């Protein structure tokens, strides 16, 4: 009677269903763990009957949402710079060197920018470097030579800021406040960046999870400002071929939990000018909202990323490689 | 007189230049190194000096290219399967489930993928699980599935072989052997794959370097199987958001470095059904040779990777959106 | 309301157990997976389901309660694993001929990364010999990055360590790569060695859980603990228990060690397992100058042995020239282990 | 020809050495940067090639040589770090009330993961007082993942900790996150703690170094060696040299930790800096079971002093509650510490 027993379970099954929703609409902490193991007289160990009602427990489940989330507001946050909406559904580019050297130097690059019909331009006046001896930026000087850039080329300027007091500082000389990776959880400095009215570029951390890169924003977010565009950059791993391993999955994963745009920066994820092409075509396909790369009038002189850096020429290459790819709407 | 002072640099820059490349020129191992320091009187280092003089000897530079590297042969290599030139240019798609569970569910896949019109299925006989309690696969069994549904649908069929004295056993049932990822580094597997004359689909180990995939590689092509298609399936790291982190710069790095195919596993590498689509989008534009991904008709009570596998419903969705995204011929 | 939901609870324990009862009956009156036969259950589950929950939440639940029902199985051992202290509480002693290993006392297991001749690995049983230990290591058959480089002299480096160890008294610890190679190993090494880069090569664990031989089990190059338990079960689920766990660190971003020494694995698998586990410290650091200090934590971080590389002339070895430790150093070393009251 | 090969190596050394002179008299004779005059330098040397290497062979030469020059200044300390052996090659001994770290006897530092209230932090105080310890941690401002989750007392914390440390006699280590608030800090802490998420918080750490007060540097949460070497030597660039490094685990797959403790770090930096080096083996493990056992492979590897969390009442804490011992457990681990004759 093999086909008896299976009715029984089928029958059991049902008794179950019965039971577990009739409780459910009545429930409606580890009080009833304790008596329930009390009451086990086998087949199954307390660890495993534990674990059981556990999960039916759960089942049996607001405005708790972090401000950042789709959950607290379900419409795409669109971040304009300079006239051009970041986050609408056509991508930015944003090049420029890694370091400011020189007003010469930017202005070469700015110009290569404004041929092209783009209106943004990065450039770094405060380096964070693994050594102190490495060139750690003009300061206050290089914003001032960005403001000045962007007065005559009429484009907007994206720059690092590395302590909270310069934030209120850079205000008066760029457009978009960028905090790198290695200060994601630089707390104090993120609540800084919060109290401003200006757009925030957030790198994600050299190895940062989803989970705290969603954090870093929301301590942006809670101090008022909204304007927060997120930044794919790599993440670190074992691999010695790459600097870093781009984490592309992470674009359609912050997309869907939160309303934020969010960038691939080519040039720091691989570090390695071979790849930017390729790894741009993929950050547009998976519907990145931009994408940032260097450029260099000289990068064999270059005081960083000498090698990861396009010059005008290989700029142009890649520019036209970008166009001819149907991937972008210029 | 701090010109004068340029001026004698610039000279001693040319003479420089005059005796590395009269110097070069006669040199065409670390007795120089011991004579060069014993009259090293300042201002560098003796560790400086020796650095600078290995730069110097390193630039004073065949046919011991890896069979596999593009140093050997220039050409992309072809792998044809079932009449599908893989490598040739346009994007291949292998969809299937992740384990054979018996031929009505495969069969029903095997209807899903002939009514789009492709030529390719996967699907596990043998699974290598991280525990013995877990289900192992059908083994030879499913194998002789995997080949009736290949007669009757008139589908090439990639299914994984875990150890070499299965290798031959596989060439009457399978068109294309597949190497896991847990046994990338099983060398003997790979000499076995190496001598029989069927295509072969290696995937990448959880933490495998871009040079071991390489090498191993090479193990297989060294015993004279040149038919081989690479596969990036993910990394291990220590995000949680995923359930690896799909490294797709190897795309770009492999195509480069190698004359081999390679194709993307969409499914393995980010664990999630929601990064399905975007991750072969971006595939497909960094210009792999293939997607791969997993398809089951009742994926909640599969044997392995229930959550992570498109139902026949989802399937068709996923296709629709592959050919409407205008990145693939088909 | 409490009073009425603890009477509940009460009823679904007695159901879920009745269940769980009828089932495992049904396992007696007849493969263990049943994929249709959950389909069919589901199918009636969700067309009788009136809310509150949606189908979804209840295909959930009762997928748990299926789940569940596994562990029942005579040869389902998830939940009290063959190889953890919830099976065997006392701690497992494998012992190599005459020295137990786990019993509290560390052991040393010394030797070439690679046999290279016989001259060579009996200079190195030699020193040992001298110190009055019972152990060699060497390898035959050699894992390689590259198929150009060394790959072991085979069956032959097989037998050259069996004469050395025949001679000097020593055991036998080597490496076997593939499952047929197995049975022939047996009449030259005392313990079977299962490389990192094979910690999943599944058939070749159940091959080595077929025979009645000390297993060497090395953890994965980037294997998690949960793995490497699994790996182990692989091996004991065949009937061979006889296994010791080698930590031999992981992969990492680090470029200043080749591995990084996961030293908090020891106390991890000792209160988790019975198995004895040893610490390599070659092998993780990479480094020569680290050997001593990680030799040093790894002892008193209660590991049951330590392995490390000795070669006669590590200048000329076909494997880990820089790594290995030459006669001299090997000296030094062991009197420094001698020296920290850790053994 | 080696004859005439071996002439033209000395003429190159006197050369490139001349050249050295030549250049460094010219940053006396005047930023250290400066790519318009190494352009300037290169086109003439470009100009000028005539094979048999091609230009980018030659440039890449010039520029290592022009990147060594660097190094011949005096405010440049790339190939001899402040930090390292090579610059002083006897250990820093950094002390702390009286209390020498780093000079061969370990230090053991304990207190709450929080500041929370002045009975909290003041029996905990009790409890290391009665061992016949030193030092006392606890979090003021604390680094959350989450805005949501507590952040500290603040000052007020810091008030607490300084109010408990004076009636205990205890040293306070504490964590101060932003550049403003090392100059309060001063009056408050005697050792100011930079958090592992601020390794490389570059403004932070130059405030740090501009001030007399003892620095413990915890190491990022996936930083290198050199990286950890290069963030001390922000701070020792500036002045300050009473640095102590702390080894608190690396982030990596592994999920039955928090962190991988990364023993082998200890040393690594012990023999390439001479700064003292301590070990936090709360914040490695992340569990309460491997405390002992890592403070113990620490203490034999050679660390200058162990880290860890106590808290008289764990289940209410505000941060680490399943970390951190509460009393009893306190005396037993400090029990067994004295056993194990590391101390
Ligand atoms: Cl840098
Ligand atoms: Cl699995
Ligand atoms: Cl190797
Ligand atoms: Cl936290
Ligand atoms: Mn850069
Ligand atoms: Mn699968
Ligand atoms: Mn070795
Ligand atoms: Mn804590």
């Given at each position: 009677?093999?086909?008896?027993?299976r009715?029984?379970v089928?029958?059991?099954?049902?008794?179950?269903?019965?039971l577990?929703?009739?409780?459910?609409?009545?429930?409606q902490?580890?009080?009833?763990?304790n008596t329930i193991?009390?009451?086990?007289?086998?087949?199954?160990?307390?660890?495993?009957v534990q674990?059981?009602?556990k999960?039916?427990?759960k089942?049996?489940?607001?405005?708790?949402?972090?401000?950042?989330s789709?959950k607290?507001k379900?419409?795409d946050?669109?971040?304009?710079?300079?006239?051009l909406?970041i986050?609408?559904?056509?991508?930015?580019?944003?090049?420029?060197?890694?370091?400011?050297?020189?007003?010469e130097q930017?202005?070469?690059v700015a110009?290569?920018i404004k041929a092209?019909?783009?209106k943004?331009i990065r450039?770094?006046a405060?380096?964070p470097?693994?050594?102190?001896?490495d060139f750690?930026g003009?300061?206050?000087?290089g914003?001032k030579?960005?403001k000045?850039?962007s007065?005559?080329?009429?484009?907007?300027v994206?720059?690092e800021?590395?302590?909270?007091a310069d934030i209120?500082?850079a205000?008066?000389?760029?457009?978009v406040?960028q905090?790198?990776?290695?200060?994601?959880?630089?707390?104090?400095?993120?609540?800084?960046?919060?109290?401003?009215?200006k757009p925030?570029?957030?790198?994600?951390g050299?190895?940062?999870?989803?989970?705290?890169?969603?954090?870093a924003?929301?301590?942006?977010?809670?101090?008022g400002?909204?304007?927060?565009?997120?930044?794919?950059?790599?993440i670190?791993?074992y691999e010695?071929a790459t600097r870093n391993?781009?984490?592309?999955?992470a674009?359609?994963?912050?997309?869907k939990?939160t309303?934020?745009?969010?960038?691939v920066?080519?040039?720091?994820?691989?570090?390695?000018?071979d790849?930017?092409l390729?790894c741009?075509?993929?950050?547009l396909?998976?519907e990145?909202?931009?994408?940032?790369?260097?450029?260099?009038?000289?990068p064999?002189?270059?005081?960083?990323?000498?090698?990861?850096?396009?010059?005008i020429?290989?700029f142009?290459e890649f520019?036209?490689?970008?166009?001819a790819?149907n991937?972008?709407?210029?």
């Amino acid at each position: 009677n093999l086909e008896e027993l299976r009715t029984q379970v089928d029958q059991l099954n049902i008794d179950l269903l019965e039971l577990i929703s009739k409780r459910a609409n009545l429930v409606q902490e580890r009080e009833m763990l304790n008596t329930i193991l009390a009451a086990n007289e086998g087949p199954f160990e307390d660890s495993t009957v534990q674990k059981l009602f556990k999960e039916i427990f759960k089942a049996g489940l607001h405005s708790k949402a972090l401000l950042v989330s789709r959950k607290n507001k379900k419409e795409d946050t669109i971040v304009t710079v300079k006239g051009l909406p970041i986050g609408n559904g056509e991508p930015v580019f944003v090049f420029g060197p890694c370091s400011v050297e020189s007003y010469e130097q930017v202005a070469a690059v700015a110009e290569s920018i404004k041929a092209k019909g783009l209106k943004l331009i990065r450039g770094g006046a405060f380096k964070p470097r693994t050594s102190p001896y490495d060139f750690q930026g003009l300061g206050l000087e290089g914003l001032k030579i960005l403001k000045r850039v962007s007065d005559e080329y009429g484009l907007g300027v994206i720059s690092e800021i590395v302590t909270p007091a310069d934030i209120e500082v850079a205000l008066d000389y760029v457009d978009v406040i960028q905090i790198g990776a290695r200060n994601m959880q630089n707390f104090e400095l993120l609540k800084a960046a919060g109290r401003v009215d200006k757009p925030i570029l957030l790198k994600r951390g050299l190895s940062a999870t989803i989970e705290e890169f969603i954090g870093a924003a929301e301590y942006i977010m809670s101090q008022g400002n909204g304007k927060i565009i997120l930044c794919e950059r790599g993440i670190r791993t074992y691999e010695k071929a790459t600097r870093n391993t781009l984490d592309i999955s992470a674009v359609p994963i912050l997309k869907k939990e939160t309303h934020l745009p969010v960038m691939v920066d080519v040039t720091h994820s691989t570090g390695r000018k071979d790849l930017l092409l390729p790894c741009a075509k993929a950050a547009l396909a998976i519907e990145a909202d931009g994408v940032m790369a260097e450029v260099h009038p000289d990068p064999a002189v270059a005081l960083s990323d000498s090698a990861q850096q396009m010059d005008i020429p290989e700029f142009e290459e890649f520019w036209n490689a970008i166009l001819a790819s149907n991937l972008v709407p210029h």
